[PDB]
Amino acid sequence: VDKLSELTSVSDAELFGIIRLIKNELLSVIDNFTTFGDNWSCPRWIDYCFQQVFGSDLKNLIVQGDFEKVFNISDTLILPKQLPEDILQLKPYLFYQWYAKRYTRILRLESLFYQILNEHITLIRSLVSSNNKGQYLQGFMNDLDKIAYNAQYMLSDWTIQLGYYDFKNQVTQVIKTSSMTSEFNIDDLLYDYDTFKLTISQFGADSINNFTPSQDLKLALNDNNSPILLLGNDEIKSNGSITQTDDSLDDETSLLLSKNTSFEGNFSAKYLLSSVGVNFTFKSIENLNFSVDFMNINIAFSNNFFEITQTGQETKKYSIAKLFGWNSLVYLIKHSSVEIWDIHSNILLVSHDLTAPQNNIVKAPIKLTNLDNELILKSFEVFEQDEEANYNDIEQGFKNGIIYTAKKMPIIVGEKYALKSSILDDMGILTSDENKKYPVFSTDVEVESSLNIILESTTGDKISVDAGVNIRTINSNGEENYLGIEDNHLIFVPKEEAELFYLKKAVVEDTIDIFYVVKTLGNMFINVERISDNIYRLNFKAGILYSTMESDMLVLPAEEANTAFYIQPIGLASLEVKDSVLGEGNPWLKEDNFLDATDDYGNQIDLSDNRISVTGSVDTDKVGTYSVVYSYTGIDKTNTEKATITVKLDKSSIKTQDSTLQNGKEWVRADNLVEVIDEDG
Amino acid sequence: DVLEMFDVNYESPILESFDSTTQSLNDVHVFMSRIQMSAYDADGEGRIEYRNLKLYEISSGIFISTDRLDTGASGVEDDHEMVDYYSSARLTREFLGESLDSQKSDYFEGIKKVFSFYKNKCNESRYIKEFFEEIQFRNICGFPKQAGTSSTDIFDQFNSVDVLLQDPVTSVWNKKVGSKKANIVIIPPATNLPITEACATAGFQPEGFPKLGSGSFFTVQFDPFFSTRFKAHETDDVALLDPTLTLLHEMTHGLHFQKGIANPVNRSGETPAWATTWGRVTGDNDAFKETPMEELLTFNKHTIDDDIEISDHLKSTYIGFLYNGRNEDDPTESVDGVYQNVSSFLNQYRGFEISSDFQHFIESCYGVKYNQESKKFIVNPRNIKRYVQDGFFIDEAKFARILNIKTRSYYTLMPDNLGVWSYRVDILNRLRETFDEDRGLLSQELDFHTALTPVVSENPALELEVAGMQRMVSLPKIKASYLPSDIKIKNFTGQKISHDTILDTNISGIIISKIKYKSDFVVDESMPRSSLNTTNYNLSPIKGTKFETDIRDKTSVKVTVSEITAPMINHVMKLDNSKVLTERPSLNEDLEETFKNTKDVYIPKTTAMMKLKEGADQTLGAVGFAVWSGQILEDLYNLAQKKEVSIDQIKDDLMSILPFYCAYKNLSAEKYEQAFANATLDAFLIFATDGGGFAGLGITVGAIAINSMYAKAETMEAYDSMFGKYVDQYQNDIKNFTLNAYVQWENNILSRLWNESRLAITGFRNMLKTVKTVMEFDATNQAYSEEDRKIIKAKCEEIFSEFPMLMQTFAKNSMTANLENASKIFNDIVWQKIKEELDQYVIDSKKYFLDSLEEAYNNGSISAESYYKYQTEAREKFVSPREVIDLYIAAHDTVVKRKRYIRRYSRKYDLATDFKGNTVHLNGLGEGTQDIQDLYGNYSVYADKKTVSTQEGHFDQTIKIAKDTNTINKVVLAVSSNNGKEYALNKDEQYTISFWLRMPVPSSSEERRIFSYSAVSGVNKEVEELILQVKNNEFVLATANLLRNSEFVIEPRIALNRWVKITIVNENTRIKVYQNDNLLGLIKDSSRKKPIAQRGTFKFYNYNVDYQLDDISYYNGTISQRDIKYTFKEDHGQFVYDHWGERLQYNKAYYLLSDDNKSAFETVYETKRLKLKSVPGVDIKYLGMNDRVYGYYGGLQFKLVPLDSKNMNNYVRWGDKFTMQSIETTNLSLAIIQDNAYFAPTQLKLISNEGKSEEEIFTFDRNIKLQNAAILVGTGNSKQGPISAYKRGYSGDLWINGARLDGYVTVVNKSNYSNDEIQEKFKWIFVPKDANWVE
């Protein structure tokens, strides 16, 4: 009221300010009644209408006894003068009798609130569309269409709730006030709510799609079988090679965007109160440089930095973690903010404040220019979402069934992985003991022989959670020992006495990582039990205490992270150095000629690690070349990288002396600076 | 192994001769010793003295004494009681009808029975075993080694107790013969302390300020024979504090004393501001309340009605500030921290060649490693972060969840005077069986324990008066009654970075993901537990006192406030009970006039109290009272519903308020809605004044300034140090700024609004005690008719029975409004101002870096290589931080942790719950034959192995229950929560039992029983409450614990081989039944007969068909229909299900049916075109009747082949693409093929799948996650790529409908018009050929 009174013009800003108040007026609900019914979801604007007419709201005048007074219901149900052979048969007869006698008198006051709801929304369509001309307006009228369609169903659903607890009350009163069936099972004459409600009205406010579908990117073929490319249902442009690849995160195909390859569609937010976005899955190989141009915002992913430019505003660079494998990203455009989400782990990545007003209602294009090596897209949906839709409450993972490594590539049968524990990370190395009968997690730094892991199923290559595996164990030399179980200990067995292990997806409390518990068919879960200061056993315990079976996952508490394992790849060890041409006297640290290193699992480590030794120094005073050996000493192999640092002789002096010029003495350089010599002199 | 107790009695002889050669000191167990105490004198001056005490080494490092050291007078007279019982006679004289020696013999046998209970709880939980180890067997190291202790000497005053013999020359026990390993000392409460006061103290506190990491053995002054009463979470159900938890609260305090992380202290000696929380009441003189964060971490109890708690990210901030210390701008207020005190202690051994037993003594003390070369301790700044983090791995709240014993802090004890606090606990079972060694106290109901009889009982109180008025409000003197103070804004300034500045390195900001698993404690049997080193100490009286935890403040502050605080509004809203009501309560609608009468009750000006101030009209009899009281109940529920408002401060969001909150600003609930137009964020505060002045929301954030560079040397190496260091402090300033911003939000906003959430639930509970007493006074109105009082008093007791659920509904809404307000103030005010300030910090520091780098290069103070190094460095480092995203992920992990707490909230809880609210996790943990075991350890499962099985099945595992056609009503599975203790019985108990049930069709009406819940009505007594059975040819949920005991016929056919979910919400009055997610009906209009507890048995009986069960659950309170629908959808997870309710499987023979007709495909006469034909129904007998149910075995069967074939038992999830292969002919698969020779031009056909075929890849519509059924979508691709629109007919997705002449396909509409109407999805059903279904 005070918004629509103190207004001579509706701004584009006040369009959003109004539609939130109409959504808070016509979609607001008072929840609880708790007598004459429990689920009584009455809209707020109708009880205000009953408050203005009768002084009290509708709960305070059903209690008074004015339900049949204010609904103009002037009739009660009656049994027939001859009841059937089965009093079960007057179960729907009282549903037809109550519909005619009493519900159509409720339904005729639903008619009046449907007319008052339509005449109010007609007025705010009149007060805004005549006082605001702007590109946002079609979003306001489209959203008033959505609030009207939803409030007309919320009004519809509320009379069924009023109807159900009136039908429930009239059927008790029709057989308590009769001697024919005075004592009888009234629950044989009543209906449950979802058979009463779906008999009257098949659809309610729960059946409304609040937003239009998500516009899947797809390859297709014409009637002339020409390779078109859809975005939902409408063909879009395509500029380069977009072909299919079996390289997927699951056993589906995937799209291969080649170098400098782009499609271009169109999109628009239908409503004002919506966030719009791009949901897409891709394999994050190195040197990816793609760029999505969505709703006049360019979001350029480049070398694990995010650049977001609004059209006509400053480019802002955003630093993320190194995205390692298959990533699900959502490029959300909100009001006044652009947000990038990881949907594997359900965390925020980038949040860029929009400095210009963002209009998502006009049609703006959707590009994806690839700009570097071949982007393996899996999905690409352009959706439109609720503005207060959280990505925090969703339980994390691909929700796929495939078991992934910590670097989010799927596990293939073979391929020599590495079991890591969650208690003790990458620094906790799986190995064999002195007797070569147990696998042991040793957190030493002098571990002799690491033990890699090979899972195998004789099924599909991407290993499912639903399939049991055998876990071979191969050391640095190639001794293959299958893992088995005796006396509740994980030991080494032959092939024929191996045991089916069932990897199950799990999470522990205060982390965002996806772990795996390893169980058997008998619910015996591998625990990492500590036996020495630096040595851990793998002993099976029956079930996980205080573990919650969620959807298919286990929610481990922080105290039961023994059972949480994860898997890393191997042979990803790297060390890259450069050759820096120094000068005589110019300083050198060991991190100057070091570019980038990487663990056996692919972790980007630096020179401050206790595995990279720099054997050699320089002088920077004598002219001679100096070779510095950088060396990463792994768990099994040590790779050394030569880095030579020349010290080129520099003799750089620009010796000067002072001068006094004469009467307007034309000036050149040569009268002052006297001795200038280069590096070699 | 762990609490392995020595053969030591009270009657065991003391050590009087040692001889030093024949016998070991490790075999001495009773001896005289010396413990450092905080003695007092006649002056009241404290001094830290040593006291002689006879010790008794009851276990391998644990000593107890029975002496009550003369530590000065109490100052409080004998047999008085402030809140703890003060006496001077206990363990000094004859006290309460027993001699000194009998008190001394009982205290030995009493403490040794408490530790007997802990040893029985050592083997039943790994989490208690890891505690008693970490606390008894630990190596303890203290830093500033005193006089008479050499370096490289493993036993000194920190971790040993002296063994004293008596002199020949005099009777004084001071002839030291050695000192053995000490971890714990349990003495009685001393002379200067009350009888019931448990207090933990570090054993040795040296002179000077305690260093963080300086460990000590801990002394506990604890008496297990006394307790104080507490008002439990169960409202006005008073209980007794369990003394076996009161010791575990102090050992938790004492584990911090062994690690050194218990008294964080700055350089000036005081506690830092980040280590306490301060309350405040301002007025004539200021009153404050300090609650240290070590107390908040020892009782880290996560409930709404407990102020003594911190979040997991605020805990980690305190854990990380103990580890790395915290430099302030004033360096006398900096904290040294653990890492910078262990590292300053282990560098004294850097060139000294310590021994092997001393090296292992430290390497297990601090997790460090020692190399034989270089003679030094390599200290690791991750094993010390792991050292401080593992000091707080457990707390009194986690002990009370393992041990099902109820608790409340001494720091939140409200004197609601039900009488006397101090009770006598009988731990030796002298009068009745009170305390076992297997189970603890067999009750906490204070009718067991004998109450003490004091002479004077003066509760301490905060006396608040309004300035110009006259009414004293004696609040409790606890943290709840004070305004929680804002944390001081930091205001980060410049650094002036040089090449030699030792800037911090181990600073971690907000940590998002951390495994907080306390690493297991390795034992070392090859380490000495004593030393035969007579070295005299300095036992001179140090002037001061020792830091004692859990000291109870017993003063009373009088403050004359200016403004009425919410705690006071809460107070005067209470009926002021204690009287018998002669006149009506003088209900007063004005707050500033209630403080003028000292007899009025402040009622808010709502339409619930204005109908209570004006009574019922007595002219109308029972009917007018039912309308009056009934309307008041409805008008109180209107105050409980959260309603959204709008603020100009919060863009794009509607903030929430409860109508009740007007009570705290004395508004009419419609003038209160007026005040949110033209408003600020300093509204939404019900508690916005400390008593003197306005105290608004501290949303202001300190400004962060860029650092300077000042080179003191002009070398090229000095600038490469300075240009490197400037980026290093740039990252350090951001990591401290985003961490200071989390603690400003989590304290000033989230903790302030959560405290105003619980000040509202208190005040709403207080005004509901005014509704009760006025409706009860009006029910005893003599003007009413005497047979109308039978109807009127029954109505007052019926509106009262709805207070339970009203106050749950109010608490779930007051929490949800104030949590979403604190969530929205973060997203819109705090995190926006962090992002706005750090954007100017990133930009100005980059501008400052790249104007000194180009200045130093052009001048020539840096090389060309170094200029190119730090230009690529500024491009990669001076960028938008990921710590403002880590600040987001921190603040939205605390909110999710509290959005989950509100979802599982119960007014009354008994068992340790889940995060879903469940208290049961039956699992089938068996090698070959599965024995069912509860995984939460709350329940005890009896499973008759002849019939109860456990299979793979529904979601993970089912409990199959076999037939018994011979003997009816035999319990075969019984999941009990009944220990045999005495619980708080109430009629006002709600719960929610819930289980999935798959039962085939039962042909017989044998009038058996399926299932019976039976709640605990006493001590090893149980009344049946909810019986599901076959009663008259229909399943009936009967009822056995109501005053009238109605039944409820399950009309929907639940036994048709399909997985149903039966939820029974048993409130007091109503019992709602749910099938899956729809309310089948109620049992109302009757209350509970016998009072019950929230413990009980889940007796599942034998039936005459093999039925199954799954997710048998029990919730401590009611579950909404909203929350039953949400639980039901999330129970199904990400799978697509059969009709039977079992997950779909690839390579499985599925009858594909239509879900509306149940009509199935069929080939046209000879061709491969499909025609949907109807599947005939089944004439069954269901419980002896003649039901006619849906038939499912008709027509064509279809596998779902995946895209590259694996094997059968893989499950189908939402988003899994497959290929429907015919089974009757294996070489044919479903495809959608355009023919243009039929009426339907784009029919659904069976095409050949041999070789490179273009069979259609199908899927299910992911965006419609149905249960029991799904919508097929022809994806439009094949295994050879996308299908040609010439061959197919269309190009994209096709829904598969039941319409020929459309060709059973319609286009999936994704245009901007598809949600203008209702979608009309066509559901399909997959029935596999099941063996419990015949047609």
For the residues of A212-255, what is the DSSP string, one character each?
----BEEEEE-TT--EEEEETTEEEEEES-EEEES--SSSS-EE
- Residue contact B651–A336, C-beta within 8 A: yes
Residues of B in contact with A145 (CB under 8 A): 1316
Whose tokens are 């141009």? That residue is: A293
Contact A217, A184 (CB under 8 A): no
- CB–CB of A372/A288 below 8 Å? yes
Written as six digits, the tokens of A525 are 């879960």
- Give the catalytic positions of B in this structure: 250
Chain B residues near residue A48 by CB distance under 8 angstroms: none
Check the annotation: does B249 bind a ligand: yes
Exposed, middle or buried by CB within 10 Å (0-12, 13-18, 19+), for A643? buried
Please, which residues bridge with residue B1065 across strands?
A: B992, B1072
Answer for the pair B452, B422: CB distance below 8 angstroms, yes or no. yes
Question: Which chain B residues contact residue A223 at CB under 8 A?
Answer: 1284-1286
Please choose, from the candidates B46, B36, B37, B43, the residue with its C-alpha nearest in 3D space to the C-alpha of residue B543.
B46
Task: Tell me if A212 and B1081 make a contact (CB, 8 A cut-off).
Answer: no
Using CA coordinates, name the residue in chain B closest to A561. B517
The DSSP letter of residue A186 is: G
User: What DSSP state is assigned to residue B1092?
Assistant: B
Give dist(CA B947, CA B960) in Å, integer: 8
| B1291 → chain A, closest CA residue | A220
Do the beta carbons of residue B1243 and residue B1170 sit within 8 Å? yes
Mark yes or no for CB contact B1282/A221 under 8 Å.
yes
User: How open is the CA angle B1103-B1108-B1110, to the nearest 5 degrees?
Assistant: 135
Token pair 């018998």 in the structure block, residue: B580
Specify whether the CB–CB gap between B517 and B422 falls below 8 A: no
Enumerate helices (H) and strands (E) in chain B, giving the number of each. 23, 60
In whole angstroms, give the CA distance from residue A185 to residue A174.
Answer: 13
Q: Write out chain A residues lying below 8 Å of B1132, CB-based.
A: 551
Secondary-structure breakdown of chain B: helix, strand, coil percentages, each rounded to the nearest 5: 25, 20, 50
Cα–Cα distance between A79 and B172 in angstroms, integer?
Answer: 102
A589 CB neighbours in chain B (<8 A) are 720
Comparing alpha-carbon positions, the chain A residue that sits nearest to B1294 is A233
State yes or no: B80 annotated in a binding site. Answer: no
How distant is the Cα of A208 from the closest Cα of chain B, in angstroms? Answer: 6
Spatial separation of the C-alpha atoms in residues B182 and B140, rounded to whole Å: 9
**What is the chain B residue with the closest CA to A244?**
B1281
User: Which residue from A minimizes the CA distance to B1146?
Assistant: A466
Question: How many whole angstroms separate alpha carbon B1312 and alpha carbon A270?
Answer: 7
The Cα of A134 is separated from the nearest Cα of chain B by a number of Å equal to 20
Residue B954 marked ligand-binding: no
Contact at CB, A522 and B927, closer than 8 angstroms: yes
Q: Which amino acid is at A426?
A: D
Sign of the torsion angle spanned by Cα atoms A594, A596, A599, A603: positive
Task: Using alpha carbons, list the distances in angstroms from residue A57 to A49, A61, A66, B410.
Answer: 8, 7, 11, 45
Chain B CB contacts of A562 below 8 Å? 517
Q: How many CB atoms lie within 10 A of CB B507?
A: 18
Cβ-proximal residues to B55 (8 Å cutoff; 6+ apart), any chain? B30, B31, B32, B33, B63, B64, B65, B161, B185
Choose, out of B721, B865, B869, the residue to mutate when testing the contact with A (most A CBs < 10 Å).
Answer: B865
- Is residue A576 within a helix (H) or strand (E), and if so which, with residue range? strand A574-577
Strand order in the sheet with B461-466: B473-476, B461-466, B558-561
Q: Residues 6 or more apart from A664 whose CB is under 8 A from it? A: none
Tell me which residue in A353, A392, A529 faces B896 most closely, judged by beta carbons.
A392
Tell me how close the Cα of B1238 comes to any Cα of chain A, in angstroms: 19
The answer to whether the CB of B756 falls within 8 A of the CB of B565 is: no
Per-position b or e across A569-588, b if 16+ CB within 10 A of its CB: bbeebbbebeebebbbebbb
Phi, psi of B613 (to 5 degrees): -65, -50
CB B396 within 8 A of CB B56: no
What does DSSP assign to residue B827? Answer: I
Q: Specify burial of residue B16 (Cβ count, 10 A radius: 0-12, 13-18, 19+).
A: exposed
What is A329-360 written as a DSSP string? Answer: EEEEE-SSEEEEEETTTTEEEEEEE-SS----
- The partner residue sitting opposite A213, judged by closest CB among B889, B1078, B1314, is B1314
How many residues belong to chain B?
1335
Q: How was this structure determined?
A: cryo-EM
Please state the separation of Cα B769 from the chain's center in Å. 29
Q: Which residues pair with A678 in a beta bridge?
A: none
The amino acid occupying position B216 is S
Compute the C-alpha angle A511/A514/A520, nearest 5°: 120
Under a CB-based contact definition with an 8 Å cutoff, are residues B68 and B191 in contact? yes
CA distance B858 to B305: 65
How far apart (Å, rounded) are the C-alpha atoms in residues B1212 and B1200? 9
Pairwise CB contact (< 8 Å): A232 & B1310: yes
Q: What is the CA radius of gyration of chain B?
A: 36
Asked if B892's CB is within 8 angstroms of A38's CB, the reply is: no
Name the burial class of residue A200, with classes exposed (0-12), middle (13-18) and buried (19+) by CB atoms within 10 angstroms of its CB. Answer: middle
d(CA B1267, CA B1272): 14
Which residue has 């460990």 as its token pair? Answer: B215
Cα distances (angstroms) measured from residue B1273 to each of B141, B174, B1308, B1314? 69, 90, 8, 17
Retrieve residue B613's tokens: 């101030």
CB contact under 8 A, A551 and B1134: yes
With CB atoms and an 8 Å threshold, state whether A464 touches B835. no
Q: Which residue has the tokens 């005081």?
A: B270
